[PDB]
Point group: C3
């Protein structure tokens, strides 16, 4: 009829929820979100270094010096490059650009260009380096031409065969770009370069190529029915390059020196620049976040969290919050805040709550050991930077898309399952911890007290604030109340 | 004995077996196999849409119209394309087909061609459109030729320059195929085309080309020593194509309108179609899609289960089956229980009793079927592999493709296997917990009113008929009611009775 | 007050430490490291078959017969090809080898060449097969040239058109290599081959190609400003190849028969063969492949363990070591107990002594050594990387291939780390459960005839001696037969 002690556990006001492999929407005591899902809608600069936003200039446009990309004629250093989905200013004069995508992929490994001149327009004596302009490349008004290459026209009805060498004495790699003109007619050829059969031969310690003009009738594009095929090579230091040509040569006036290699990318965003700083950016926005995961977009540059195709990823830190003298068989105690598991005693003197400090900090330490482990354990999740492919590279494009989405699916599965399988185990680690300290108080006071069936013990010898601490301490001396209790339960047996 | 209650669990004779991570081959009561292992050996329609059967024809054969191959004159829609692995009827006149494999890949995202005329054979008045036939492409026995292109010959010992344009007035894309002829020797060039230096030249909005013949002396394939190189493009709508040739031109007569882009495939299979239909086609037969997994072939088309390199995959859904060849759950299952996974065996008088904790039984069943659904949910969005062809100088990217597909098939085969193995051990781990929770539920109520035997039953320190039974099942047991009765019970045997 | 039976479990001297998901450095009685971490720094034969050591030669130099490179006249088979990272003898005459990477791939699935003659060097009755030499291909001072091709030159200011056929009347596939010569100017063209307009054409069933020489003026490399481009095809059996050329032709003298196709590889190492043998080799050395996993280097060939980028990976097998008036499992483990994992202790009238529960201890050894093999087993199929090479202009697929080699490595490191951690947890929690379930075997037998002392021991109310102890150990305590004696003494203890 008195002097008791109950085993119980923390409950509270929370209603955050987690999931388990078996049961879903389980309400828990505490729970951490590990998935960031919010991004500012702005293109920011990575680690203090601003991107190169090309507005609607294509990279081809940029590198060739399209007459409408004059903004980026001398572009500074860049963290990343943002091209729009379909840039408007590219090859204004129709034609193609060989190994284009392979060139853009090299850019992702470079951070700064120093454009230097090798063949000054002034050096084209014995040819016409002035009239080579067209209405396909208007400046302001009409008819200009790419700024970084020159279109050589016959002069005084002679196109003397050209031979010109340049020597990278620099210590940095050089990017050189040249082209060849594909005219409409047998007549347009003679009119432009006099000689009917021509060729453009370029030479490197690496690169041996001859090009001959494929001459044909075509639909006009941006006004023109002819086309220019463009070529590029990387000339290493101490290496030299030799051009020889009898016509249709589009020669380079400039080259780009690769002054800073390193991490970079080309992102496909129609957004534009804002004045912020970020450690991780995305086609749709930047991310301030210490979360281990995010779900805003597969592509992301910089030191940043790690993308998952999921809508929620919350981890269970505390108890199933099932709030309800009573004991743990009927629910959790709201009246205890000291810890996760603890006791309630009654006695002659008065009642009170007390946490099992030993078990709860071990819980805390063992739960923190898991969450910190999991988050910053497997850091090698498949992060990426995308790439482009041309109209006859479809199979390897798919190969790439197939693989990229392949690892996306694998890692999200890994994340989802770990969260669900660990939510299941912490939730019944808690369950177990409250059972074990129930057993530690019953193996202490043995037949000195009566199992009630609610999680509570009535005593046969009545003990207070020192023996209550003594049962809480794992210190309770059974032989001291041995024969005191024996007399009461021997009295209880008769009446 | 005087009045007992027992707690025990369902058993039956079901020799279904499951594996777990720790132990193998454990006989359960209930188990859901989830791995389809069978196929029907036929090639079928895909939910009503028939596959395009090329029989003995290669894709190149069909498109160029090799006389041994037939035309799909109704212009059907297909669900997939079946080609023999080594098709007899391809480029009957020897040559090659540039970016053949890229084109074949395009086909896999297309479901319906309609063939149209762009250059009628009756429109080459300036040249010979009839004599360009050959013994390597027979028909009636007579020497014939590809039906979709035209071998133009010098007319009257003259080969006037050819300029023709075609404008895609349609809203559909157009696949156009033309070629060039490579003769044996300088004399053949003159004999067929007069002009001894020639080119074939095409101009679209984004394609630019001027190709010239390569004279070599070659072994006789199919009886000819000259060759034919073929090219294809896609002429986008509102665009135009212009051909310039001064000899050796193999002119397109037709063109194919892509009128359905969709999900399609090129299966390489030797079988032939019969009247069946399926949700899921593989090269060696069709399989049912009732189950989430199959091990029949990694290339399957349609609403398919997910493929895993495994021989068995059985999900434990019930209990262990340890029956007794009386006592409760410490010696194993009762087959006396019909409805209910966890029940009682109340004994009062010399007959019997077998109930079922209906409640904790329908809490296990409502989570085992729940979590099962959740397992099959978690994989679906797995890796599915895709057919793709390569040639003899793309052996690297071919190997990359194959390593990556075997790669992900291995990952998920491991993922699925280890996921069920764990769910099997934890599904049975929950029955042991569930039965031990049934025992303790009664125990917390009865206290010193009943005696524990290490058996799973409680002999009663008083009398309990049917109503007292249902009371302890429903958790509504009045210890302070029989307490007094039970105490005098208990004192008799402690003294000597 | 006496006569005891205590439930306990094993301890020992172990320093060893495993990890779980929520515990780090946990000391266990027994464990098993499963990650190979060292190598011998030698390069070895692969189970009795030696690698092809190219020394300082590229695959090109070896195949074409660069003079500094040696013939493998013995036609040996090989396990794997070893080539340095920047070999020093390649295309001594500067030039290009088309689809070179494609060729090496074929090599990496090829295990034995036999070299055969197809166009004997003496056979060019109307051309110069001897002046074709260069200062860029020095063999012992004087000028020389690739030993397996022949640089055919005009005889007496004449280059009669060339047309030669070879029929493959072997059963194997043949590799045939040929090439073409791009001169510096139009002058040297006529100086070597006279005929100014020229070509080199190759016919097979599956090969049509006529190259024409690209004359430009290039930088000098190993002395030369001309260049030679090389080609290769694979001529199927019963097929013919016929070459037509009016100049600049570099005719093969020899062909290679692929006589053994199979598993091979091209390793990039700088070591040298060491008169040793292994089951698994890596560019840095051979590894002792008897663990299931290693972290030595990603590219490893042969019957190899599965590679993971961990620094440590060790399974749990025995109990958690917590040793230290005898008490049961609640105070920890018994260093006294040796013959098993779980078991009992008696403290009766004859003395004290430990006994193991073999029946339960074995079902635990049975399983745990089972689950071990089952972890080596479901990594039977993991992911092993294969060497592939690419040129600049294939830098996109090169990255694609390395993003995905790295991707699978990372996935499988995750799984291996995560599987060991999680079953370490379940191994220990298993031991927990057995020790508990052992206690209850005794607690449900003895029933009202013993009291539970709350530390894993029982005090019998009756006398027990040796064979009733053996009785409860054996799962057959005759409780009908001592309740009498116990019923007496509980009444004795409840008052007196
Ligand atoms: C490989 O090439 C080198 C240089 O072309 C050869 O010469 C020796 O190379 C080593 C490098 O391992 C140098 O340190 C020595 O000084 C060189 N000479 C001598 C006499 O040792 C080397 O012989 C070639 N072969 C091999 C198998 O390395
Ligand atoms: C819950 O209780 C806390 C006080 O401990 C209070 O600050 C908070 O606003 C309450 N509301 C919710 C939604 O948790
Ligand atoms: C689970 O929780 C979410 C959030 O409240 C809710 O939308 C959903 O209906 C819940 N349960 C089920 C079975 O969908
Ligand atoms: C190109 O960018 C400019 C920048 O002001 C923008 O005004 C324009 O809308 C873009 N082009 C087109 C065709 O919309
Ligand atoms: C290029 O410069 C290097 C020295 O920097 C020199 O060795 C080489 O001869 C030069 N080449 C030419 C064509 O001037
Ligand atoms: C497991 O038992 C099945 C009986 O269904 C038998 O076919 C199989 O061989 C056994 N496998 C093992 C590994 O014991
Ligand atoms: C699919 O199920 C039907 C009955 O629903 C069965 O007759 C048929 O054999 C099954 N298909 C296969 C491939 O086993
Ligand atoms: C396809 O070729 C095989 C091989 O000769 C032949 O048996 C079969 O009849 C051919 N099919 C048709 C429709 O010609
Ligand atoms: C197609 O028609 C003619 C070709 O004769 C051409 O002049 C015209 O501009 C084209 N128009 C289109 C493609 O809309
Ligand atoms: C094609 O051209 C017509 C008229 O020039 C135009 O109305 C139509 O939208 C265009 N469609 C495409 C797909 O180019
Ligand atoms: C585990 O052992 C290593 C060995 O000294 C030590 O560095 C580490 O701190 C230990 N434990 C933890 C919890 O990190
Ligand atoms: C290889 O194995 C043997 C025997 O297991 C051992 O003695 C030796 O030290 C090992 N060496 C290396 C380098 O792994
Ligand atoms: C090589 O084969 C050709 C054609 O395949 C044949 O005519 C001849 O028998 C063979 N040549 C020689 C020289 O045997």
């Amino acid at each position: 009829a008195g002097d008791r002690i109950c085993i119980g556990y923390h409950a509270n006001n929370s209603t955050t929820q987690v999931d388990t492999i078996m049961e879903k929407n389980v309400t828990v005591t505490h729970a951490q979100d590990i998935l960031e899902k919010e991004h500012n809608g702005r293109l920011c600069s990575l680690k203090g270094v601003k991107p190169l936003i090309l507005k609607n200039c294509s990279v081809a446009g940029w590198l060739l010096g399209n007459p409408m990309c004059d903004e980026f004629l001398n572009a500074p250093e860049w963290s990343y490059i943002v091209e729009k989905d379909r840039p408007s200013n590219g090859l204004c004069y129709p034609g193609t650009f060989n190994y284009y995508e392979e060139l853009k992929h090299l850019m992702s490994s470079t951070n700064q260009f120093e454009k230097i001149q090798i063949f000054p327009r002034s050096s084209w004596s014995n040819h016409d380096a002035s009239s080579g302009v067209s209405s396909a490349c208007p400046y302001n008004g009409r008819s200009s031409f790419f700024r970084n290459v020159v279109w050589l026209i016959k002069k005084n009805n002679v196109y003397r065969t050209i031979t010109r060498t340049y020597n990278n004495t620099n210590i940095e790699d050089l990017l050189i770009i040249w082209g060849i003109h594909h005219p409409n007619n047998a007549a347009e050829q003679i009119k432009l370069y006099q000689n009917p059969s021509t060729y453009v031969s370029v030479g490197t310690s690496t690169l041996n190529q001859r090009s001959i003009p494929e001459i044909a009738t075509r639909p006009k594009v941006n006004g023109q029915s002819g086309r220019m095929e463009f070529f590029w090579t990387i000339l290493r230091p101490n290496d030299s390059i030799t051009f020889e040509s009898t016509g249709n040569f589009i020669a380079p006036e400039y080259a780009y020196k690769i002054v800073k290699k390193g991490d970079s990318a080309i992102m496909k965003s129609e957004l534009s620049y804002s004045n912020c700083d970020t450690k991780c950016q995305t086609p749709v926005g930047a991310i301030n976040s210490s979360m281990p995961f995010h779900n805003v977009h597969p592509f992301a540059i910089g030191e940043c969290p790690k993308y998952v195709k999921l809508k929620k990823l919350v981890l269970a830190t505390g108890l199933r919050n099932i709030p309800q003298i009573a004991g743990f068989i009927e629910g959790g105690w709201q009246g205890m805040v000291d810890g996760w598991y603890g006791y309630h005693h009654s006695n002659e003197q008065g009642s009170g709550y007390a946490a099992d400090k030993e078990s709860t900090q071990k819980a805390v330490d063992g739960i923190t050991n898991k969450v910190n482990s999991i988050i910053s354990k497997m850091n090698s999740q498949f992060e990426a930077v995308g790439k482009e492919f041309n109209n006859l590279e479809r199979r390897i494009e798919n190969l790439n898309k197939k693989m990229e989405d392949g690892f996306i699916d694998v890692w999200t599965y890994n994340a989802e399952l770990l969260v669900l399988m660990e939510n299941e185990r912490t939730l019944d680690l808690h369950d177990s911890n409250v059972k074990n300290l129930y057993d530690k108080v019953r193996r202490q006071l043995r037949d000195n007290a009566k199992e009630l069936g609610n999680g509570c013990f009535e005593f046969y010898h009545r003990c207070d604030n020192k023996c209550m601490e003594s049962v809480r301490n794992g210190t309770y001396d059974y032989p001291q109340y041995s024969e005191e209790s024996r007399l009461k339960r021997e009295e209880i047996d008769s009446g």
